[PDB]
Amino acid sequence: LNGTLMQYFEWYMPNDGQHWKRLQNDSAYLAEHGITAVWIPPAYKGTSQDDVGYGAYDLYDLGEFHQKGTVRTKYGTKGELQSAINSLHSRDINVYGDVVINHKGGADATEYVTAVEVDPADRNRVTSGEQRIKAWTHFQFPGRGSTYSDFKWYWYHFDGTDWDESRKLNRIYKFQGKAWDWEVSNENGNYDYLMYADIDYDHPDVTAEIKRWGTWYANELQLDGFRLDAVKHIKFSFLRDWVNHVREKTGKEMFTVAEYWQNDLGALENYLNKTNFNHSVFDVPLHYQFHAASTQGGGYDMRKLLNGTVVSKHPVKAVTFVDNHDTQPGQSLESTVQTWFKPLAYAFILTREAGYPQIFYGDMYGTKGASQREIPALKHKIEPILKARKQYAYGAQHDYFDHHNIVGWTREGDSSVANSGLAALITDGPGGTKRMYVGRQNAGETWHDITGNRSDSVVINAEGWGEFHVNGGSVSIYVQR
Ligand SMILES: OC[C@H]1O[C@@H]2O[C@H]3[C@H](O)[C@@H](O)[C@@H](O[C@H]4[C@H](O)[C@@H](O)[C@@H](O[C@H]5[C@H](O)[C@@H](O)[C@@H](O[C@H]6[C@H](O)[C@@H](O)[C@@H](O[C@H]7[C@H](O)[C@@H](O)[C@@H](O[C@H]8[C@H](O)[C@@H](O)[C@@H](O[C@H]1[C@H](O)[C@H]2O)O[C@@H]8CO)O[C@@H]7CO)O[C@@H]6CO)O[C@@H]5CO)O[C@@H]4CO)O[C@@H]3CO
Ligand SMILES: [Ca+2]
Ligand SMILES: [Ca+2]
Numbered sequence: 499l500n501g502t503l504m505q506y507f508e509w510y511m512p513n514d515g516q517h518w519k520r521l522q523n524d525s526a527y528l529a530e531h532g533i534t535a536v537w538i539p540p541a542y543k544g545t546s547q548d549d550v551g552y553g554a555y556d557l558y559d560l561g562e563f564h565q566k567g568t569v570r571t572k573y574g575t576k577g578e579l580q581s582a583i584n585s586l587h588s589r590d591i592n593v594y595g596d597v598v599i600n601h602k603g604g605a606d607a608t609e610y611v612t613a614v615e616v617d618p619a620d621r622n623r624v625t626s627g628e629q630r631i632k633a634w635t636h637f638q639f640p641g642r643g644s645t646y647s648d649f650k651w652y653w654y655h656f657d658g659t660d661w662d663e664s665r666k667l668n669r670i671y672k673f674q675g676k677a678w679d680w681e682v683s684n685e686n687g688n689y690d691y692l693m694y695a696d697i698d699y700d701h702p703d704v705t706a707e708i709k710r711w712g713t714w715y716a717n718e719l720q721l722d723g724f725r726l727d728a729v730k731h732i733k734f735s736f737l738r739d740w741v742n743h744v745r746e747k748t749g750k751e752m753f754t755v756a757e758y759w760q761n762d763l764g765a766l767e768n769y770l771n772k773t774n775f776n777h778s779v780f781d782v783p784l785h786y787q788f789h790a791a792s793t794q795g796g797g798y799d800m801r802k803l804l805n806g807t808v809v810s811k812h813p814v815k816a817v818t819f820v821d822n823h824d825t826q827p828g829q830s831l832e833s834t835v836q837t838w839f840k841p842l843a844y845a846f847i848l849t850r851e852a853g854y855p856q857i858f859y860g861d862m863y864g865t866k867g868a869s870q871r872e873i874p875a876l877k878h879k880i881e882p883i884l885k886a887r888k889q890y891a892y893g894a895q896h897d898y899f900d901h902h903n904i905v906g907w908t909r910e911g912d913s914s915v916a917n918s919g920l921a922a923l924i925t926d927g928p929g930g931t932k933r934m935y936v937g938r939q940n941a942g943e944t945w946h947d948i949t950g951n952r953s954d955s956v957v958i959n960a961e962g963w964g965e966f967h968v969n970g971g972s973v974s975i976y977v978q979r
């Protein structure tokens with residue numbers, strides 16, 4: 499009954515074209531461990547075969563056309579993806595597609611464009627007169643032709659770019675007659691511009707086309723929902739309308755979660771408000787708290803985990819997580835939750851009632867970057883916690899955030915899930931004990947630590963309390979034997 503998301507990729511997976519096949523072959527394992535939805539990496543042609551997917555060359559090429567030196571994407575072919583999705587749906591696993599509509603990379607040809615430079619710390623400030631640049635803005639899709647869509651892109655569909663090919667120069671250029679979109683993040687004055695050619699969401703043909711593509715994409719892959727990339731760089735009212743549009747055309751719920759990357763609840767709440775709460779956001783602040791706790795050696799006040807997060811104020815609109823492809827070692831938003839703390843963070847997201855939790859492929863299977871700082875495979879430490887969620891994390895919750903280090907929570911169980919109920923303890927410092935209430939209805943049951951970290955059994959007293967133990971820097975989750 500509890501739903502669990504999985505981000506089904508990490509940044510450094512090998513470019514062998516086998517990822518979709520792997521996903522298909524992992525569907526039985528995912529279903530058995532209680533994963534009910536997967537977020538798949540962008541499925542369309544990037545700027546090269548080894549693009550992780552955020553280049554977004556051709557949104558209508560799902561690994562079907564020979565473009566950018568390849569038919570397949572990094573991950574495989576359209577057919578392979580569709581076979582994987584078909585296996586996942588056969589096991590009631592929903593599929594959320596990644597939607598990268600901020601920009602387009604890898605244009606087929608340059609165009610001469612009149613532009614001005616803007617200040618990278620304040621993109622509202624113009625720092626040059628008009629100049630002629632060669633911008634990568636012409637998309638003809640020579641390998642695709644007009645199959646699925648005859649829409650061609652030119653400079654006038656974009657607000658700007660970060661490269662002039664004539665002078666070989668990396669600067670933020672705003673095209674003549676264009677204005678950065680609003681509302682976007684107010685960081686750097688206006689954070690519309692991120693990378694590649696920035697899509698102009700003031701352009702009515704562009705808004706129409708991206709909405710149309712949205713519906714096509716959903717149908718083509720039989721998607722159940724969306725993950726929205728880089729939303730702080732995309733006109734908020736457009737995103738709102740886009741989500742409503744695809745829902746209207748497909749007739750389905752299309753659960754949607756946006757990646758709004760800011761460690762600030764206020765900014766996330768503004769975004770929710772400006773999109774009428776029609777979709778969820780990732781709980782970025784909670785991730786940063788996990789990161790802080792993991793790097794402070796016991797010095798973090800664990801009571802802080804209850805405040806300043808999306809899940810603390812808008813639990814129905816939070817997707818909670820520990821790490822992702824941007825926070826993993828080496829990557830652009832690097833803030834990795836250290837290995838020792840990572841299971842404790844997973845207990846917090848998986849066994850508490852608030853939020854829609856997500857597990858990271860990189861945490862399960864490890865990351866394959868070229869460093870000696872990669873995330874090791876933690877599948878065996880995470881499996882028990884997933885099981886706790888799937889089978890035990892039901893009913894009324896009681897919180898025990900009453901200590902700088904050792905914090906815990908219980909779940910009473912629900913009569914709809916047989917033998918459900920748990921008692922969780924995590925500590926960033928020394929271990930110890932906490933007496934916690936698990937419900938009088940559990941009186942006399944014998945509970946054991948599903949993680950195997952503690953070998954002691956705890957018998958629940960007549961008043962519904964047990965005396966629970968946790969080791970130093972560890973997690974224990976007690977459930978009925
Ligand atoms: O697994 C489901 C769910 O579990 C967790 O949610 C629990 C939550 O943490 C608790 O706080 C409590 O919820 C109470 C809530 O917090 C109170 O605010 C109140 O809610 C009332 C609303 O205030 C009121 O507005 C109205 O709500 C309606 C919505 O406005 C309307 O949009 C629609 O809701 C839909 C969502 O918008 C949509 O996103 C989708 O929701 C899914 C979540 O996005 C997804 O994360 C997950 O939710 C988790 C949640 O994250 C945990 O925190 O699955 C959701 C279901 O698919 O779909 C929604 C439904 O279509 O409709 C609602 C009302 O129908 O009314 C509500 C009261 O009904 O009281 C709440 C107590 O009921 O308990 C929940 C449940 O465990
Ligand atoms: Ca933008
Ligand atoms: Ca614009």
Ligand code: NA
Pocket residue numbers: 656657678679690696697698699
């Ligand atoms: Na723009």
Ligand code: NA
Pocket residue numbers: 796797798799800902903926927
């Ligand atoms: Na602490």
